Design a protein around this nucleic acid. Structure first.
Ligand code: ZN
Lengths: 101, 84, 215, 60, 154, 128
RNA sequence: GGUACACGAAAAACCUUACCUAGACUUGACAUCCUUGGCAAAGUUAUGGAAACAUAAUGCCGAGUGACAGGUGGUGCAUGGUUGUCGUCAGCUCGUGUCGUGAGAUGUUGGGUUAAGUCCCGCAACGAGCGCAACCCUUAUCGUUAGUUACAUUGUCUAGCGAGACUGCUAAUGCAAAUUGGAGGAAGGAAGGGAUGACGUCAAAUCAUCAUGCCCCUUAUGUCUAGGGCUGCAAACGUGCUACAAUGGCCAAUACAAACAGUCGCCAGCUUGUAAAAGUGAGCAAAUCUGUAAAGUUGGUCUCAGUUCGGAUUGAGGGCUGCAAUUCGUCCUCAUGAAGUCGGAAUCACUAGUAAUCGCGAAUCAGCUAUGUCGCGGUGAAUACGUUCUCG
């Protein structure tokens, strides 16, 4: 082993893409590695930005966009160093940004 | 208030006023920094402070201590309202 | 006054055009203002390539610009003389430490993309072609390709003053009101000799039922 | 006097408080978003274009 | 125009067992705070047991019965110098207006502290004095004076 | 014999536990008394009005934990949890609980502050 | 005018800044092309200066050359794009055909039915398009996958999937849409809300986001710099805030959110400080750590009056950012306490978790009497009988 508690945390601005990535990781880790509790939903940090529509005053009609940022979490009980060797080839997409322990 | 060396000056105006005060104390010297406060040494001279158009002269006296240099120079005129 | 038909379905029926992230608001602004420059360079400098769109993909000092253009060879050039040139402007506008690895791929049935059709409208109008017949030829050639209804409208100086003489064209089912519609939208500025001509094209490209989410 | 404002905004300022925020593409010195360095109307046009990675329509 | 509007229901208070008491506590409420008006009304209750020892429910229903107005006034004009028209109003609005009169007249008096002024208001309403019965009597006296208009109206 | 439930009125959750005990029920909410937690109003009375149309605190313990909201939302959540708990204890209570409209999650919640409107409904003012 | 007046501007002491005064500069602050190359580019310290700057020196950049660069200069009565109003109002049209010499009409009209040109019966009309509808998001119930940094007198909870509600069933009456009633059910007859705004009108607004033809300037309407002014002042209007007091003033104990945000920042705890705060110094890239909810309850004082309400104005002493607070910031403490005891003609908002009202968070931003704006939760109403008048 020599590396217990691989606490990988994945965060993205999309849900179905992050769900696909976590499904792929849970299926690939379902091989050599064991004792991996399932995906951990997180409160999906959210913000709203509001912008006036017209180039001129027209204040009474303004719209607003929203940059959603979904969040999940994984914990790995032990490395099983061959498992990280298999892990080296995952090539996750750019939309999901990783953060391990 | 600065609360730490409260008496504040642009720190460039000190050299010429100290020089003149020790150089027979010439009255007319042109200053633009309304930013500065007066040290106790300041009393004695005149300065052609700039308001935004031209230079108006102010004579410093020991009567007051601590007040801002530029407050002696009004910048905005009075009402001068017409009838209608 | 109505909303841009692209934005309403964008992000829930259409995948984003530039997927990337960086350190929080430190230089994400830099990356956006940089890759929009690449996008503008593609849509501006090379009219002859008819680039439909560009995909920007950055992750921590790497970039890959997928492109979809009707005619790839003009971007490629003769014996690859133009690809190296265009990639060196991309580099000098992106820096030097970042790998580029651009790719160019022809787009199947490009004539169903509003971008290239609007560009063709701009080229025709700027060339003093009578606007009505150009509209009709472009409309027929687009519709024959097997698509649904079209909406092309043009404002600006229609060969003279009194611009409030604007022509509009609608030729079938194109439901803005339906979110699950798979509609395309574009816009070009046909810089005529008398001012600015804005051409707008709406393309209905079939139903997008059972999509679930973006592709 | 707009382009000279562009070049002045770029230069390193004599004072920490001398400089201010501004959109890179255009010189509108108002309503610029520090989280995107892009003017509010510029932000709207690029978001309808969709260059920003995460943009939706608010239902919230 | 519009159609008929359904009414939201009001629940009786299961301590004194009267929904009219609930409408009391609702109308005398300000700022949207049941607690403060609740304490005020219950202190007024305790004062009802304190002086003039008698069932607070009995003096409550007596005040309601005395303050209730028999007829209402409705405006139906033709031209300048408009003319009123007295019409019939159902009991729900009658008790609502009685409670409104009690509430408004209570906060119009001497004895600054709210407890004693509202207690004196309910006492006077039970005893038929000029505090609120005067207003009801006046509004009744304008009625049936121009009842010719009431008979032929729409 | 524990009996369960759940209430979610106005952003306020409420988990309940009910057991038929020796006493009249020994009301205990959040391990403390309701009298000092909830000010003595009809709000404290609201929870036993489900019981009034039933065996009114004959033998039914109260073990409730509360989170979220203010106190009125807490009261609604715990009331709905109680009515669900009696329904779980005895199906025969649907006809009398639903007739009085005690269940069904009134779902009256503060709306979203719509732009241009001060409190999502108030316009600033009108001027000509 | 509605559709302008807490608007552009989601933040003017310098910059911002477009104005004025003054200082200076001129293929120029910035860009390409022509010719010529390869080492300095910035920043730093004396020096005169208020500073651009000329100096002297450390550590892609240069030098000569015209098209010109540049204009927050003009023309929204040349404009593109964008936006407001009618208006989320139900309306606007087209193809074929018929009628009429013709503009034109017939569809879109007639009956019921709805929020709807929603639907269906009748119909010289038959169909079709934009719109409306539904497809999206979001809250309301249940089931499932998952368990921490939540929770754990534990399955709450969060976020993914699925179910649920589809006039589904029954009663009536109708041809039929459909209407109402009942049962079940969390929700029943467009469940609450958001997103979504047709043809067009107002030569509506925006040449000062941007682009933009034409006109004008160019050793200046362009460039940099210091000061000011955008915060004035006899006056009037608009939108807000505090109130004008015992439903209250003040003091002590006292518990209850949600959402959002945060490693040059949030700031825990501790010490000093009547306090602004200052210092120490963890934890926190974050469901962990932090950003003490206020109303509310209990107790006490106050006892109705320009007041133990009210807080302006003014004086002083402190604090913070920032080089710097006089025009021209803000906080705290001490000092005084204007006027006002509910307000004229007239008006505005609102059909429920709404009004009112209590607080909390964020943005631009180092600082901001933002009382503004954008958002979150706490407490928490009346009435709609009815369309005669009034507005559209
Ligand atoms: Zn911009």
């Amino acid at each position: 082993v020599k590396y217990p508690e691989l606490k990988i945390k994945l965060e993205s601005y999309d849900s179905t893409l992050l769900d696909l990535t976590t499904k792929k990781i849970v299926e690939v880790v379902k091989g050599v590695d064991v004792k991996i509790k399932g995906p951990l939903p997180l409160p999906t940090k959210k913000e709203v930005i509001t912008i006036i529509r017209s180039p001129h005053v027209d204040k009474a009609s303004r719209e607003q966009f929203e940059k959603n940022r979904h969040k999940r979490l994984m914990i790995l009980v032990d490395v099983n160093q061959g498992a990280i060797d298999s892990l080296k080839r995952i090539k996750i997409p750019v939309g999901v940004t990783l953060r391990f322990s | 208030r600065s609360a730490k060396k409260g008496a504040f000056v642009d720190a460039h105006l000190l050299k010429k006023v100290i020089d003149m005060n020790k150089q027979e104390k010439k009255r007319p010297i042109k200053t633009w920094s309304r930013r500065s406060t007066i040290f106790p040494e300041f009393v004695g001279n005149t300065f052609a402070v700039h308001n935004g158009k031209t230079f108006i002269n102010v004579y410093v006296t020991d009567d007051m201590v601590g007040h801002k240099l530029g407050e002696f120079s009004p910048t905005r005129n009075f009402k001068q309202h017409t009838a209608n | 006054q109505k909303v841009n038909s692209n934005g309403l379905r964008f992000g829930i029926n259409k995948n984003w055009i530039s997927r990337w992230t960086a350190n929080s608001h430190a230089q994400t602004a830099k990356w956006l203002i940089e890759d929009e420059k690449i996008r503008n360079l593609f849509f501006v400098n090379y009219r002859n390539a008819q680039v439909s769109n560009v995909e920007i993909e950055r992750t921590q000092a790497t970039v890959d610009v997928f492109v979809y253009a009707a005619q790839p060879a003009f971007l490629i050039g003769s014996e690859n003389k133009n690809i190296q040139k265009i990639t060196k402007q991309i580099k000098q506008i992106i820096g030097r430490t970042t790998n580029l690895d651009l790719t160019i791929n022809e787009i199947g049935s490009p004539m169903l993309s509003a971008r290239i059709i609007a560009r063709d409208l701009a080229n025709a109008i700027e060339a003093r072609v009578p606007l009505r017949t150009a509209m009709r030829q472009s409309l027929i050639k687009v519709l024959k390709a097997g698509a649904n209804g079209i909406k092309v409208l043009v404002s600006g100086r229609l060969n003279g003053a009194e611009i409030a003489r604007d022509k509009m064209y609608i030729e079938g089912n194109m439901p803005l009101s339906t979110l699950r519609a798979d509609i395309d939208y574009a816009l070009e500025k046909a810089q005529t000799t008398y001012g600015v001509i804005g051409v707008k094209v709406w393309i209905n490209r079939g139903m997008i039922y059972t999509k679930g989410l973006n592709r | 006097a707009k382009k000279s404002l562009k070049v002045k905004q770029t230069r390193i300022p004599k004072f920490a408080v001398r400089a201010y925020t501004r959109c890179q593409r255009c010189g509108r010195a108002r309503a610029v978003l520090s989280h995107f360095g892009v003017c509010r109307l510029c932000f709207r046009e690029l978001a309808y274009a969709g260059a920003i990675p995460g943009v939706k329509k608010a239902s919230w | 125009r519009k159609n008929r509007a359904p009414k939201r229901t009001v629940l009786p208070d299961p301590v004194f067992n009267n929904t009219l008491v609930t409408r009391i506590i609702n109308v005398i409420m300000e700022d949207g705070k049941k607690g403060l008006a609740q304490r005020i009304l219950y202190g007024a209750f305790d004062l009802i047991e304190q002086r003039t020892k008698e069932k607070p429910l009995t003096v409550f229903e007596r005040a309601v019965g005395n303050v209730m107005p028999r007829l209402e006034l409705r405006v139906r004009r033709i031209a300048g110098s408009n003319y009123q028209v007295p019409t019939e109003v159902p009991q729900d609005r009658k008790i609502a207006l009685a409670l409104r009169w009690i509430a408004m007249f209570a906060r119009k008096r001497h004895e600054k502290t709210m407890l004693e002024k509202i207690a004196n208001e309910i006492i006077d309403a039970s005893n038929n004095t000029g505090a609120a019965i005067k207003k009801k009597d006046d509004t009744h006296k304008m009625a049936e004076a121009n009842k010719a208009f009431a008979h032929m109206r729409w | 014999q524990s009996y369960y439930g759940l209430g979610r009125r106005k952003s306020s959750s409420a988990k309940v536990y009910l057991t038929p005990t020796q006493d009249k029920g020994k009301i205990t909410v959040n391990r403390r008394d309701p009298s000092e937690y909830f000010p003595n109003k009809l709000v404290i009375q609201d929870m036993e009005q489900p019981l009034d149309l039933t065996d009114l605190k004959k033998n039914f313990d109260i073990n409730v934990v509360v989170k979220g909201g203010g106190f009125t939302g807490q009261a609604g959540a715990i009331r709905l949890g109680i009515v669900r708990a009696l329904l779980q204890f005895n199906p025969e209570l649907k006809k009398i609980l639903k007739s009085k409209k005690l269940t069904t999650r009134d779902k009256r919640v503060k709306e979203r502050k719509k732009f241009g409107l001060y409190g999502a409904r108030r316009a600033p003012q009108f001027t000509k």
